[PDB]
Amino acid sequence: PEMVRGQVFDVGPRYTNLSYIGEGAYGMVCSAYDNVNKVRVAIKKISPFEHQTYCQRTLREIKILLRFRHENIIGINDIIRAPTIEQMKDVYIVQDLMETDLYKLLKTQHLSNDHICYFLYQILRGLKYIHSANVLHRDLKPSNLLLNTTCDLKICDFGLARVADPDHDHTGFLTEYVATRWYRAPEIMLNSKGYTKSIDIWSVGCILAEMLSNRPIFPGKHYLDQLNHILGILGSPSQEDLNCIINLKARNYLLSLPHKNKVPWNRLFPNADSKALDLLDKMLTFNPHKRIEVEQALAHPYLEQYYDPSDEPIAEAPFKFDELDDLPKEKLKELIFEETARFQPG
Ligand SMILES: *CCC(=O)Nc1ccccc1Nc1nc(Nc2ccnc(C#CCCNC(=O)O[C@H]3CC/C=C\CCC3)c2)ncc1Cl
């Protein structure tokens, strides 16, 4: 049994000469030489079986990624686990090895306008496919965008994804939420459960602004502070946009605030392409109903050199709506065992 940095990393004989890459959202990720395809691959070790929530997320990641097939979405190449439910303690997910993620790249590298434009095109082309399957990613952020040595981009980590449920999107003010703070749409903190496609567009907007300056645009330090940052740049919402917020706690909180002026995008990003800034404005719209949708974003002049709807595929079928929140970890283990069976010899 192979070992890395104290931990069992039990992937062989197919996968050899392991090197530690890092820690991701679920534990240890290694690279390894795939003896069958004769390439290095990325392998993540998942140990979810004690907790229903880790089980739920591992199952979502696995079901979604195995169903999706798209050039801008990470696939699953292989899944390693024990031959029986009883013996199964860890799951290893094998994926294409990528050179970096956008988080590391933004810490270290200035992006040309040409790179920003190509990265944004690829994120939206991947998201068009995701949203066409009636799926919300709900955790788009630079660390969830992988890049290879030629800057092909792939969306990863569908652990927090859900089937879109707009008619059930309303909630009260300051309702707890799971997805990463800096990339959370303002309505999350106000009156939204994050069950509509507009939640992902806000996150892409945040990513775009971060590509323009290498710094997060709304680096809140905590839940309501995230909204301080957003309003500090967008300015006070209009009467129309407040009238759309029926919940009194949410609306009266906004009305309690001193007037804030819009900060013009060209002042925040004086070196940015004016077309990139027009699209940024449309993605970072306060009112989620007025926020641009993925297919309109692809059609925006900023992306004219790449836009080609005939080469921006959609999913053959929408995804199976929701069913895991009430399933215990024992049933969830069985479903994980079942979903991974195709990678077993035979
Ligand atoms: C989808 C989210 C996710 O899984 N992210 C994540 C997070 C942490 C770790 C791994 C992953 N997944 C993942 N990563 C990659 N590829 C990747 C990610 C991060 N960093 C790297 C890297 C690197 C450095 C390359 N090595 C290098 O330059 O080696 C030199 C060093 C000099 C010394 C000796 C000789 C060797 C040459 C890669 N890909 C896929 C996935 Cl899923």
XYZ file of C-alpha atoms and ligand atoms in Angstrom:
388
model
C 0.000 0.000 0.000
C 1.493 3.357 -1.111
C 2.147 6.197 1.403
C 2.879 9.940 0.790
C 3.117 12.305 3.849
C 2.093 9.865 6.604
C -1.235 8.916 4.882
C -2.212 5.717 2.963
C -2.620 6.677 -0.721
C -3.765 3.307 -2.113
C -4.017 3.724 -5.934
C -1.663 1.106 -7.401
C -0.545 -0.834 -9.429
C -2.042 1.285 -12.308
C -0.922 4.569 -10.685
C 2.716 4.881 -9.611
C 5.470 7.433 -8.667
C 3.202 9.659 -6.613
C 4.082 13.286 -5.789
C 2.090 15.390 -3.341
C 0.364 18.367 -5.126
C -1.588 19.899 -2.216
C -4.670 19.767 0.003
C -7.976 20.423 -1.713
C -11.483 20.806 -0.199
C -11.599 17.045 0.705
C -8.056 15.960 1.671
C -4.884 14.854 -0.099
C -4.328 15.371 -3.840
C -1.333 13.714 -5.546
C -0.076 13.444 -9.085
C 0.799 9.942 -10.346
C 1.937 8.189 -13.442
C -0.938 6.284 -15.095
C 0.699 3.075 -16.420
C -2.290 2.358 -18.822
C -2.630 5.777 -20.583
C 1.117 6.586 -20.031
C 0.459 10.143 -18.628
C 0.646 11.810 -15.259
C -2.850 12.311 -13.680
C -4.242 14.048 -10.558
C -5.672 11.774 -7.782
C -7.786 13.032 -4.893
C -8.428 10.825 -1.808
C -11.909 11.124 -0.291
C -12.845 9.654 3.088
C -16.543 10.669 3.497
C -18.358 7.708 5.032
C -18.740 8.776 8.713
C -20.755 11.937 7.888
C -23.932 12.325 5.837
C -22.781 15.807 4.601
C -19.387 14.586 3.283
C -21.336 11.624 1.763
C -23.884 13.996 0.121
C -21.131 16.192 -1.394
C -19.002 13.224 -2.617
C -22.126 11.720 -4.204
C -23.096 15.059 -5.898
C -19.527 15.540 -7.242
C -19.460 11.955 -8.585
C -22.997 11.817 -10.152
C -22.627 15.303 -11.814
C -19.089 14.850 -13.166
C -19.829 11.391 -14.570
C -22.952 12.718 -16.357
C -21.307 15.891 -17.752
C -19.117 15.817 -20.744
C -17.601 19.176 -21.739
C -14.182 20.560 -22.669
C -14.391 23.282 -19.924
C -15.560 20.920 -17.155
C -13.117 18.559 -15.387
C -14.053 14.927 -16.069
C -13.552 11.841 -13.947
C -11.149 9.445 -15.691
C -11.198 6.685 -13.065
C -12.443 5.957 -9.533
C -10.502 3.650 -7.225
C -12.154 1.878 -4.299
C -12.246 -1.497 -2.481
C -14.112 -4.393 -4.205
C -16.829 -4.549 -1.413
C -18.915 -1.977 0.608
C -17.461 -3.474 3.799
C -13.837 -2.980 2.716
C -14.460 0.487 1.214
C -13.058 3.276 3.466
C -11.663 5.750 0.900
C -12.559 6.677 -2.687
C -9.863 7.922 -5.068
C -10.949 10.153 -7.924
C -8.606 10.248 -10.936
C -8.705 13.411 -13.127
C -6.581 15.102 -15.857
C -3.472 16.667 -14.295
C -3.565 20.451 -14.808
C -0.642 22.883 -14.390
C -2.345 25.259 -11.921
C -5.607 26.778 -10.793
C -6.728 30.414 -11.308
C -6.175 31.123 -7.568
C -2.408 30.297 -7.764
C -2.115 32.013 -11.124
C -3.647 35.265 -9.798
C -1.315 35.247 -6.757
C 1.729 35.031 -9.066
C 1.007 36.297 -12.638
C -0.226 39.419 -14.345
C -2.877 38.455 -17.008
C -2.840 40.167 -20.453
C -6.279 41.344 -21.694
C -6.058 38.442 -24.212
C -5.704 35.903 -21.376
C -8.554 37.460 -19.363
C -10.770 37.348 -22.421
C -9.954 33.676 -23.203
C -10.360 32.601 -19.489
C -13.704 34.418 -19.213
C -14.942 32.843 -22.536
C -14.054 29.340 -21.262
C -15.688 29.820 -17.807
C -18.932 31.031 -19.485
C -18.843 28.283 -22.196
C -18.551 25.676 -19.358
C -21.285 27.457 -17.353
C -23.641 27.570 -20.397
C -23.449 23.715 -20.401
C -23.918 23.515 -16.563
C -26.974 25.834 -16.564
C -28.401 24.058 -19.686
C -28.478 20.881 -17.489
C -30.579 22.888 -14.914
C -27.570 22.718 -12.505
C -26.109 25.544 -10.393
C -22.436 25.252 -9.491
C -22.896 27.591 -6.421
C -19.157 27.742 -5.609
C -17.415 29.340 -8.540
C -14.126 30.954 -7.465
C -10.511 30.991 -8.793
C -9.464 27.810 -6.829
C -12.330 25.945 -8.641
C -10.931 26.797 -12.118
C -8.094 24.620 -13.308
C -5.660 25.506 -16.122
C -3.191 23.448 -18.152
C 0.158 24.665 -19.745
C -1.678 26.065 -22.765
C -4.305 27.920 -20.623
C -7.243 25.582 -21.389
C -9.582 26.072 -18.497
C -11.781 23.507 -16.655
C -14.398 24.089 -13.973
C -14.143 21.743 -11.044
C -15.681 20.836 -7.658
C -19.438 20.235 -8.013
C -19.710 19.198 -4.314
C -21.949 22.208 -3.522
C -24.019 22.149 -6.809
C -27.852 21.902 -6.851
C -30.591 21.553 -9.415
C -32.052 25.038 -10.051
C -35.230 25.738 -8.048
C -36.240 29.375 -8.676
C -39.818 29.098 -7.365
C -38.356 28.031 -3.975
C -35.570 30.701 -3.890
C -37.010 33.089 -1.219
C -35.878 33.183 2.414
C -35.429 35.681 5.259
C -32.665 38.128 5.950
C -29.185 36.878 7.150
C -30.040 33.164 6.398
C -26.925 30.991 6.677
C -25.186 29.858 3.515
C -22.382 27.432 2.565
C -20.606 28.815 -0.629
C -17.404 30.966 -0.471
C -17.968 34.443 1.012
C -16.079 36.736 -1.430
C -18.026 35.254 -4.420
C -21.569 35.419 -2.845
C -24.271 37.429 -4.636
C -25.766 40.280 -2.497
C -29.237 38.607 -2.460
C -27.713 35.613 -0.481
C -27.405 37.944 2.547
C -30.851 39.477 1.888
C -33.538 37.061 0.628
C -32.144 34.239 -1.569
C -31.361 30.531 -0.948
C -29.042 30.517 -4.032
C -31.370 28.323 -6.098
C -31.243 30.430 -9.335
C -28.691 30.614 -12.166
C -28.032 34.345 -11.417
C -26.038 33.246 -8.296
C -23.351 31.757 -10.620
C -23.234 34.823 -12.846
C -22.459 37.055 -9.805
C -19.546 34.696 -8.940
C -18.198 34.874 -12.566
C -18.449 38.689 -12.318
C -16.317 38.607 -9.106
C -13.790 36.325 -10.914
C -13.643 38.673 -13.877
C -12.991 41.716 -11.621
C -10.279 39.650 -9.779
C -8.598 38.808 -13.181
C -8.506 42.538 -14.008
C -6.588 43.573 -10.815
C -5.288 40.254 -9.246
C -7.187 41.121 -6.028
C -10.678 40.009 -4.899
C -13.126 42.799 -5.621
C -15.333 42.225 -2.498
C -12.998 40.804 0.200
C -15.498 40.758 3.090
C -14.245 39.506 6.448
C -17.665 38.120 7.482
C -21.259 37.453 6.538
C -22.849 40.975 6.589
C -19.473 42.692 5.847
C -19.577 40.983 2.432
C -22.653 43.246 1.706
C -20.700 46.402 2.999
C -18.052 45.685 0.311
C -20.595 45.107 -2.533
C -22.604 48.270 -1.698
C -19.343 50.247 -1.299
C -18.745 49.751 -5.047
C -22.263 49.346 -6.628
C -23.634 52.128 -4.398
C -27.071 52.279 -2.754
C -29.700 50.134 -4.589
C -32.388 52.056 -6.500
C -35.989 52.314 -5.337
C -36.992 49.774 -8.060
C -34.421 47.278 -6.881
C -35.524 47.731 -3.214
C -39.225 47.238 -4.204
C -38.273 43.769 -5.533
C -37.130 42.886 -1.947
C -40.518 42.179 -0.260
C -39.003 40.849 2.987
C -39.199 43.706 5.517
C -36.045 42.827 7.552
C -33.938 42.840 4.358
C -35.503 45.982 2.902
C -35.376 48.029 6.160
C -31.735 47.056 6.642
C -30.895 48.546 3.237
C -33.031 51.644 3.907
C -31.171 52.157 7.251
C -27.815 52.640 5.390
C -26.341 56.070 4.510
C -26.364 56.834 0.759
C -23.332 55.303 -1.034
C -22.269 56.402 -4.548
C -21.426 53.956 -7.339
C -17.651 53.679 -7.839
C -17.181 53.789 -11.698
C -15.607 50.581 -13.026
C -13.062 52.553 -15.134
C -11.781 54.220 -11.933
C -11.352 50.847 -10.148
C -9.839 49.278 -13.305
C -8.145 52.112 -15.268
C -6.134 49.629 -17.445
C -9.160 47.378 -18.327
C -10.712 47.047 -21.766
C -13.899 49.144 -21.862
C -15.868 46.163 -23.288
C -14.684 43.907 -20.381
C -16.032 46.629 -18.011
C -19.411 46.853 -19.749
C -19.772 43.028 -19.301
C -18.470 43.247 -15.682
C -21.241 45.828 -14.942
C -23.880 43.488 -16.354
C -22.655 40.463 -14.326
C -22.321 42.532 -11.157
C -25.869 43.878 -11.259
C -27.467 44.166 -7.794
C -30.940 43.013 -8.907
C -30.617 39.271 -9.829
C -33.571 39.592 -12.284
C -31.674 42.288 -14.266
C -28.293 40.425 -14.086
C -27.089 39.180 -17.478
C -27.601 35.388 -18.180
C -24.884 33.039 -19.422
C -25.955 32.947 -23.068
C -26.202 36.806 -23.206
C -22.772 37.073 -21.565
C -21.292 34.828 -24.296
C -22.947 37.091 -26.981
C -21.398 40.270 -25.392
C -18.994 42.305 -27.700
C -16.095 41.659 -25.280
C -16.193 37.987 -26.353
C -16.784 38.568 -30.125
C -13.493 36.887 -31.239
C -14.558 33.600 -29.532
C -18.388 33.651 -29.641
C -19.778 30.728 -31.626
C -23.077 29.287 -30.254
C -22.711 26.237 -32.599
C -19.466 25.414 -30.658
C -20.943 26.143 -27.202
C -22.720 22.854 -26.485
C -25.618 22.235 -24.126
C -26.397 19.101 -22.052
C -28.476 16.332 -23.752
C -30.844 16.286 -20.766
C -31.604 18.403 -17.631
C -30.360 16.924 -14.341
C -32.457 14.866 -11.870
C -34.104 17.477 -9.614
C -32.786 18.240 -5.997
C -32.667 13.915 -2.962
C -29.828 13.279 -0.479
C -30.456 15.579 2.560
C -32.717 12.933 4.188
C -30.717 9.832 3.054
C -28.562 8.464 5.933
C -24.786 7.920 5.396
C -25.390 4.113 5.090
C -27.664 4.510 2.072
C -25.296 7.184 0.748
C -22.328 4.710 1.016
C -24.367 2.212 -1.050
C -25.134 4.869 -3.663
C -21.406 5.887 -3.813
C -20.520 2.174 -4.176
C -23.121 1.860 -6.994
C -22.135 5.081 -8.834
C -18.427 3.957 -8.804
C -19.060 0.328 -9.952
C -18.324 1.010 -13.685
C -14.612 1.640 -12.867
C -14.172 -1.825 -11.433
C -12.616 -4.562 -13.699
C -15.679 -5.618 -15.751
C -10.855 21.177 -8.797
C -10.329 21.634 -7.470
C -9.095 20.859 -7.090
O -9.114 19.632 -7.096
N -8.011 21.604 -6.787
C -6.786 21.188 -6.226
C -6.297 21.815 -5.089
C -5.098 21.418 -4.531
C -4.375 20.392 -5.101
C -4.841 19.753 -6.233
C -6.058 20.138 -6.822
N -6.562 19.498 -7.985
C -5.958 19.363 -9.185
N -4.762 19.942 -9.373
C -4.174 19.797 -10.580
N -2.961 20.387 -10.764
C -2.240 21.283 -9.932
C -2.853 22.036 -8.936
C -2.092 22.890 -8.162
N -0.767 23.032 -8.326
C -0.173 22.303 -9.291
C 1.249 22.474 -9.448
C 2.428 22.601 -9.594
C 3.875 22.742 -9.788
C 4.392 21.934 -10.972
N 5.617 21.213 -10.658
C 6.837 21.703 -10.937
O 7.058 22.800 -11.412
O 7.781 20.801 -10.613
C 9.176 21.164 -10.833
C 9.742 21.543 -9.454
C 11.264 21.664 -9.350
C 11.916 20.549 -8.587
C 12.081 19.302 -8.991
C 11.768 18.742 -10.347
C 10.285 18.789 -10.732
C 9.832 19.985 -11.577
C -0.869 21.426 -10.107
N -4.680 19.115 -11.627
C -5.870 18.533 -11.454
C -6.542 18.631 -10.256
Cl -8.086 17.852 -10.093
